Design an enzyme around this catalytic site. Structure first.
Site, short mmCIF file in Angstrom:
data_model
loop_
_atom_site.label_atom_id
_atom_site.label_comp_id
_atom_site.label_asym_id
_atom_site.label_seq_id
_atom_site.Cartn_x
_atom_site.Cartn_y
_atom_site.Cartn_z
N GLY A 15 -6.87 -22.79 -10.94
CA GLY A 15 -5.83 -22.14 -11.72
C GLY A 15 -4.94 -21.29 -10.84
O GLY A 15 -5.42 -20.57 -9.96
N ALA A 18 0.30 -15.38 -10.62
CA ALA A 18 1.37 -14.67 -9.93
C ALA A 18 0.94 -14.25 -8.53
O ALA A 18 1.61 -14.57 -7.55
CB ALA A 18 1.78 -13.44 -10.73
N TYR A 19 -0.18 -13.54 -8.45
CA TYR A 19 -0.69 -13.06 -7.17
C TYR A 19 -1.21 -14.12 -6.19
O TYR A 19 -1.26 -13.88 -4.99
CB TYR A 19 -1.76 -11.99 -7.40
N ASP A 126 -7.62 -6.05 -19.81
CA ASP A 126 -6.85 -7.27 -20.05
C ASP A 126 -7.72 -8.38 -20.62
O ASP A 126 -7.65 -9.52 -20.18
CB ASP A 126 -6.16 -7.76 -18.77
CG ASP A 126 -5.00 -8.71 -19.05
OD1 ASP A 126 -4.61 -9.46 -18.13
OD2 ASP A 126 -4.46 -8.70 -20.18
#
Ligand code: 422
EC number: 2.7.11.1
Length: 272
Positions: A15, A18-19, A126
């Site tokens: 997967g 962003a990072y 999160d």
């Protein structure tokens, strides 16, 4: 001793984010699989440093295991537990959800992990289906501690103020108050995950009066789209979790006492 044990092969991409990206790594000798989170520091020094620190103090069956990390220039490599089953997100049928017994089992496991985290003073911040992984036997494990933080140290609670999370899963107080307790926020996000598992849809874009979906829930219009597909027992639990006032919201110890939470539904694995 064994000459080639330290070599790992990158089989595929699990997967991207962003990072960076997470890939599947297989040991050359043993064929043991592990997930490797590769974050390009050049693009965050502060974030990744904290993520490793938090991971190092975690050890629980419902939390993705941390095996170690390697510096190597300007690229961090986090060696984590590989969860064969993928994300919980993929087990949620759009607009349907999943069988209630499976959702109850996943919720029990989620509560186990969260109780553990909160007990050691850490809040995830999160929680959502994309960060809840499944292993070979469908055991849920909480992952990604990049947004996590310590809310209790030396037995003293620190109120939070930073805006963290994902809008559809965030508690209303995060958007309404300057400071707020950490724990009720993770409880709320677990309530939205439960809703998703039982209805296959998120109730609102964000928990604010401006969202019609949110105001309807406050006015108890449970005959509308998401809520009408759930069933009174789990719906009663949701009525206790998705309470706007975090001080009045149900705590985990009380969720563990809820009628639906303790209702027999599931059956063990066929032929253990
Ligand atoms: N922190 C963190 C962290 C993030 C992710 C993961 C995973 C992970 C992601 C993932 C995705 C898929 C489904 N995909 C695989 C890719 C395939 C396309 N190449 C399509 C189907 C199957 C198994 C699986 N396992 N295990 N441990 C961690 C830790």
């Amino acid at each position: 001793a064994v000459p080639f044990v330290e070599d790992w092969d990158l089989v595929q991409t699990l997967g991207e984010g962003a990072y960076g990206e997470v890939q599947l790594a297989v040991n050359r000798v043993t064929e043991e699989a592990v997930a490797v989170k590769i974050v390009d520091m050049k693009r965050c020094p502060e974030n990744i440093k904290k993520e490793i620190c938090i991971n190092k103090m975690l050890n629980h069956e419902n939390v993705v295991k941390f095996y170690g990390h390697r510096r190597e220039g300007n690229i961090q490599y986090l060696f984590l537990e590989y969860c064969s089953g993928g994300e919980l997100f993929d087990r949620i049928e759009p607009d349907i959800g999943m069988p209630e017994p499976d959702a109850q089992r996943f919720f029990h496991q989620l509560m186990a992990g969260v109780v553990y985290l909160h007990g050691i003073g850490i809040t995830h911040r999160d929680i959502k289906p994309e960060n809840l992984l499944l292993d070979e036997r469908d055991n849920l494990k909480i992952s990604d501690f990049g947004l996590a933080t310590v809310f209790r140290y030396n037995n003293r609670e620190r109120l939070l103020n930073k805006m963290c999370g994902t809008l559809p899963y965030v508690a209303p107080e995060l958007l309404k108050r300057r400071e707020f307790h950490a724990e009720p926020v993770d409880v709320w996000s677990c309530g939205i995950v439960l809703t998703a598992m039982l209805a296959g849809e998120l109730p609102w874009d964000q928990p604010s009066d401006s969202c019609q979906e949110y105001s309807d829930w406050k006015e108890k219009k449970t005959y509308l789209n998401p809520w009408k597909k759930i069933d009174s027992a789990p719906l009663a639990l949701l009525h206790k979790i998705l309470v706007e006032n975090p001080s009045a919201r149900i705590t985990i110890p009380d969720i563990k006492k809820d009628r639906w939470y303790n209702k027999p539904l599931k059956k063990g694995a066929k032929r253990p």
